[PDB]
Amino acid sequence: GEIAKALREIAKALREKAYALREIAKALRG
Amino acid sequence: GEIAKALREIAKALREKAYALREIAKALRG
Amino acid sequence: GEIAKALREIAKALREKAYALREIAKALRG
Amino acid sequence: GEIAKALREIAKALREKAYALREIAKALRG
Amino acid sequence: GEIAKALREIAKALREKAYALREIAKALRG
Amino acid sequence: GEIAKALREIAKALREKAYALREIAKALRG
Amino acid sequence: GEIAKALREIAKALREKAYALREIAKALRG
């Protein structure tokens, strides 16, 4: 369904944010 | 549907937050 | 609908957060 | 509706987070 | 309703995040 | 309900983020 | 259901963000 697909798109965007947050942690360690 | 469209708008905003978080990571590397 | 309108209001708030995160990146570059 | 009202409450909390993120940017500029 | 109550629980968690973000700003100022 | 339960799981994950943000605040104060 | 499943996927992504935020705190302590 379109609603479930859009919710999965939200989850995908949140995973992109998680990736970026890990990059922030790595930048701080470096 | 309007609800699914709005959920996709939320996903797009979250992708722009991911953009900004990558920008923070780059600023910390520099 | 009121639900779709409220979801769009959430999207707008998330864009507001993205803008604020970009301000953080700008402060870190400076 | 109660669901729309709760969604608007979520949007309000997200705007509160945006304010705090701008406060972080201001602290970094200082 | 249980759905509205769960959405209000989400907003409550977001306000705790806002609190923490304000304390991050306070820490950076000091 | 399964939808309400999943929303409560989202709230719980947001509380975990709030926990982490408090840890960031305490790290900056230390 | 597909909607509840997608909401649980959102919660999973939020937990990934929480993990990353904890790693930011650890990097700041380090």
Residue numbers in the entry:
A (entry chain D), B (entry chain C), C (entry chain A), D (entry chain F), E (entry chain G), F (entry chain B), ...: 2 to 31
Text taken from the publication that reported this structure:
αHBs are oligomers of 5 or more α-helical peptides that assemble into coiled-coil structures with central solvent-accessible channels.
Despite the requirements for aliphatic residues at a and d, up to 40% of these can be changed to other side chains without compromising barrel integrity. We introduced mutations at one or two of these sites to generate four groups of αHB: Group I had entirely hydrophobic interiors, but with different sizes and shapes of channel; Groups II and III had polar uncharged or polar charged residues, respectively, at specific points along the channel; and Group IV had aromatic residues installed in their channels. The twelve Group III peptides had positively and negatively charged side chains, Lys and Glu, incorporated either singly or paired at a and d sites; and a single peptide with Asp at d. Finally, one third of the designs were crystallized and yielded 12 X-ray crystal structures, all of which were open αHBs with fully accessible channels. Focusing on the small molecules, the αSA signal from the more-polar AAs and CHOs is dominated by the polar and charged Group II and III αHBs.
